[PDB]
Amino acid sequence: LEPPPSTFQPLCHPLVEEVSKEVDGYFLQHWNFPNEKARKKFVAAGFSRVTCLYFPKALDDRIHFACRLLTVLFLIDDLLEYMSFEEGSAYNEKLIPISRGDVLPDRSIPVEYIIYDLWESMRAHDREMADEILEPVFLFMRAQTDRTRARPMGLGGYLEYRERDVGKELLAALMRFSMGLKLSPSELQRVREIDANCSKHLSVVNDIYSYEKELYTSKTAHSEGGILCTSVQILAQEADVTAEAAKRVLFVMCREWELRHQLLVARLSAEGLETPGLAAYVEGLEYQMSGNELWSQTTLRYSV
Amino acid sequence: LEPPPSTFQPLCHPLVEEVSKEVDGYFLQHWNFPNEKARKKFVAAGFSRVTCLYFPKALDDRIHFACRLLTVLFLIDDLLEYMSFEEGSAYNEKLIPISRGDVLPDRSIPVEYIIYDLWESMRAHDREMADEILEPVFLFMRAQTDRTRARPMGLGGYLEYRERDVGKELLAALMRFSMGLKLSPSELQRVREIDANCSKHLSVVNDIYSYEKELYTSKTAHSEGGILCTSVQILAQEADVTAEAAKRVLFVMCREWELRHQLLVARLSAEGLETPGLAAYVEGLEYQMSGNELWSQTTLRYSV
Ligand SMILES: C=C(C)[C@@H]1CC[N@H+]2CCC[C@@H](C)[C@]2(C)C1
Ligand SMILES: C=C(C)[C@@H]1CC[N@H+]2CCC[C@@H](C)[C@]2(C)C1
Ligand SMILES: [Mg+2]
Ligand SMILES: [Mg+2]
Ligand SMILES: [Mg+2]
Ligand SMILES: [Mg+2]
Ligand SMILES: [Mg+2]
Ligand SMILES: [Mg+2]
Numbered sequence: 001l002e003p004p005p006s007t008f009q010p011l012c013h014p015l016v017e018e019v020s021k022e023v024d025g026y027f028l029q030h031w032n033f034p035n036e037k038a039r040k041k042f043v044a045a046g047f048s049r050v051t052c053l054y055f056p057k058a059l060d061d062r063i064h065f066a067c068r069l070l071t072v073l074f075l076i077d078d079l080l081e082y083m084s085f086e087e088g089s090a091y092n093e094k095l096i097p098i099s100r101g102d103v104l105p106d107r108s109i110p111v112e113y114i115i116y117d118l119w120e121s122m123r124a125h126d127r128e129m130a131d132e133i134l135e136p137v138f139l140f141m142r143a144q145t146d147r148t149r150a151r152p153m154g155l156g157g158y159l160e161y162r163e164r165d166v167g168k169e170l171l172a173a174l175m176r177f178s179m180g181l182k183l184s185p186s187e188l189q190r191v192r193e194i195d196a197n198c199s200k201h202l203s204v205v206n207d208i209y210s211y212e213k214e215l216y217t218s219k220t221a222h223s224e225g226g227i228l229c230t231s232v233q234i235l236a237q238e239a240d241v242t243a244e245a246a247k248r249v250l251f252v253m254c255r256e257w258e259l260r261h262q263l264l265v266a267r268l269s270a271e272g273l274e275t276p277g278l279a280a281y282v283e284g285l286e287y288q289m290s291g292n293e294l295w296s297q298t299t300l301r302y303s304v
Numbered sequence: 305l306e307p308p309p310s311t312f313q314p315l316c317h318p319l320v321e322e323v324s325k326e327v328d329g330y331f332l333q334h335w336n337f338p339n340e341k342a343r344k345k346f347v348a349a350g351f352s353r354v355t356c357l358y359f360p361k362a363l364d365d366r367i368h369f370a371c372r373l374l375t376v377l378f379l380i381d382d383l384l385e386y387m388s389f390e391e392g393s394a395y396n397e398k399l400i401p402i403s404r405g406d407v408l409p410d411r412s413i414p415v416e417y418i419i420y421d422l423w424e425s426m427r428a429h430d431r432e433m434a435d436e437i438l439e440p441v442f443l444f445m446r447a448q449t450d451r452t453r454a455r456p457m458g459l460g461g462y463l464e465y466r467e468r469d470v471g472k473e474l475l476a477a478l479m480r481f482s483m484g485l486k487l488s489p490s491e492l493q494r495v496r497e498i499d500a501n502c503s504k505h506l507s508v509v510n511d512i513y514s515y516e517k518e519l520y521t522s523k524t525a526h527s528e529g530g531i532l533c534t535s536v537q538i539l540a541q542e543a544d545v546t547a548e549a550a551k552r553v554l555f556v557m558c559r560e561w562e563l564r565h566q567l568l569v570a571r572l573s574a575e576g577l578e579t580p581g582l583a584a585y586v587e588g589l590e591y592q593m594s595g596n597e598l599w600s601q602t603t604l605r606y607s608v
Contacts, residue, residue: 154458156542197544238460240501245560252556256549 001208001247003297004255007262008290013052013063020048023067031075031110044300047071053291054171057284058178065122066178069133072114073140073167080144081221088145088225096138122177129177136169149229158234159200165229166206168199175284183277190273191282194264198285201257202292207231208247208254209296215243254293261286305512305551307601308559311566312594317356317367324352327371335379336414349605351375357595358475361588362482369426370482373437376418377444377471384448385521385530392449392529400442426481433481440473453533462538463504469533470510472503479588487581494577495586498568502589505561506596511535512551512558513600519547565590 013019024043033039048067055066076095080088097103098116101123105112122130143164153161163169172195176183207230218228236246265282268274296302317323328347337343352371356362359370380399384392401407402420405427409416426434447468457465467473476499480487511534522532540550569586572578578586600606 154460154542156458156544159543200543235459238458239463239557239560240504241557241560241564245557245563249553249557249560253543253545253549253553256543256545256553259549260545 010290010294011056016052314594315360320356
């Protein structure tokens with residue numbers, strides 16, 4: 001799959017080697033892997049590497065928190081595939097009071113204490129900004145087991161749902177926390193079109209690269225948890241083409257979203273509405289889009 | 305607007321100039337044009353030229369019937385844009401018994417006697433093949449004023465509907481008539497999938513090139529008759545991008561349908577199922593697709 005031309009230059013956090021070793025090492029000590037094959041596949045995914053490509057301008061003392069959070073969410077994302085919608089919802093819901101710090105974890109259950117200790121450590125570092133990531137994470141968790149996944153969706157409907165299932169808002173709040181980038185309610189409200197556009201590009205670039213993995217999962221994992229819900233399948237069905245053809249067409253649409261990001265950014269600035277915080281923010285989203293694509297193209301999670 | 309590469313090479317009927325003069329001449333004689341500007345615009349469109357690009361292997365003594373049929377359907381297609389759905393339906397329904405020859409025309413009304421005399425002349429030339437074009441024409445006519453046009457559609461539902469509104473079946477029956485190409489019911493059943501794929505290409509290439517004309521009509525003509533119903537707007541709305549962006553993506557999808565055509569024809573031949581008639585037929589479909597594109601990208605109908 002030859003990607004169409006992009007003007008976006010991906011950037012990777014400078015501490016990726018040291019932080020990846022630290023965070024992978026942490027999960028290798030604490031998380032319950034089924035076998036050595038799984039431990040190896042985990043390290044091969046490079047979950048801290050993707051986090052560093054998402055947030056290349058994170059503060060040096062904050063990037064590890066983001067890596068830990070996205071890593072545990074990737075691990076859970078995979079566990080949910082073997083669960084019903086009801087079981088997966090129960091699993092996620094138990095973690096929500098624990099994430100808030102309202103309920104102590106069972107220390108015999110790694111996901112519980114990993115989640116508790118992580119969020120405790122984020123609030124210890126920056127309470128106000130850590131708290132702002134909680135509701136975005138919960139909205140994402142609740143979308144993951146939403147019954148609407150078992151109903152036919154068109155492309156527009158899917159993209160609207162997928163903004164939650166892809167964790168767009170949690171990634172935004174996490175980016176801001178990791179950069180120490182504070183924005184006012186007025187500033188946040190101003191960039192909602194840019195956010196929605198960026199969400200489509202993240203979602204579809206992921207759908208493109210993750211399709212083979214997800215198709216296999218739909219044939220082998222749980223009938224609800226493993227259900228094939230992706231733009232690749234939707235466009236293939238609507239246009240009556242193969243999945244490979246649908247990827248090529250969707251990648252061209254991703255580049256139209258890149259152009260639209262640039263146009264909206266130029267418009268924010270030409271309307272006199274671009275603040276220094278917002279300029280940092282929308283450039284940050286550009287790194288999410290290009291970082292996600294670069295990792296998705298290289299990671300063994302999708303190629304194997 | 306840069307077309308992506310295509311391996312389909314268009315062909316034009318050898319007698320295109322003389323038949324164009326004969327057929328344009330007949331309509332300039334009989335049809336109720338409102339003024340000289342409209343007569344000029346009519347010749348400028350090149351309706352016999354597109355018919356000769358659609359059916360470049362038509363028999364020399366049948367190509368004119370096809371030019372006359374498509375010419376009158378183009379003229380009616382434009383009249384409907386100034387009508388409500390109800391008025392358009394009443395207008396088309398009047399012509400259906402006349403087309404069958406069951407009801408005599410009012411000779412003071414050009415569309416009625418043009419339609420009556422044309423179908424009488426085609427039945428005199430080849431009764432059985434001319435009869436096979438009637439119901440596909442009527443299916444197309446009914447789609448043109450269907451209320452479904454004014455209700456939300458996704459890309460898949462649009463293409464399903466637009467196979468009727470674009471006249472895919474009448475064009476296939478007309479192609480067979482013009483070539484004297486007789487296929488059995490079992491032969492036609494073998495290429496159903498190839499026909500469905502070819503309809504999407506014809507529809508979307510037309511949509512891409514005729515969008516500016518249709519956008520203008522939508523703002524100036526009847527709010528129902530001239531309603532903007534096209535893949536360019538559907539995709540733009542589903543993906544939240546501009547019409548120009550949608551056209552670029554759709555054009556890539558058209559090349560996927562060309563690859564699919566080639567794959568399906570290859571399989572038909574590989575399974576020992578491509579008869580000489582079917583080989584002529586599928587090659588005929590390819591000329592429709594490339595001919596449509598060449599005319600759409602050059603006709604003054606779409607550029608002015
Ligand atoms: C498409 C993306 C930006 C990521 C794809 C993988 N998932 C897995 C679970 C956590 C999500 C925020 C995300 C990293 C989003
Ligand atoms: C896309 C096509 C094959 C043709 C485009 C133009 N319209 C005009 C009105 C009558 C239609 C059958 C058609 C010739 C279809
Ligand atoms: Mg998921
Ligand atoms: Mg997943
Ligand atoms: Mg995926
Ligand atoms: Mg029409
Ligand atoms: Mg029209
Ligand atoms: Mg059109």
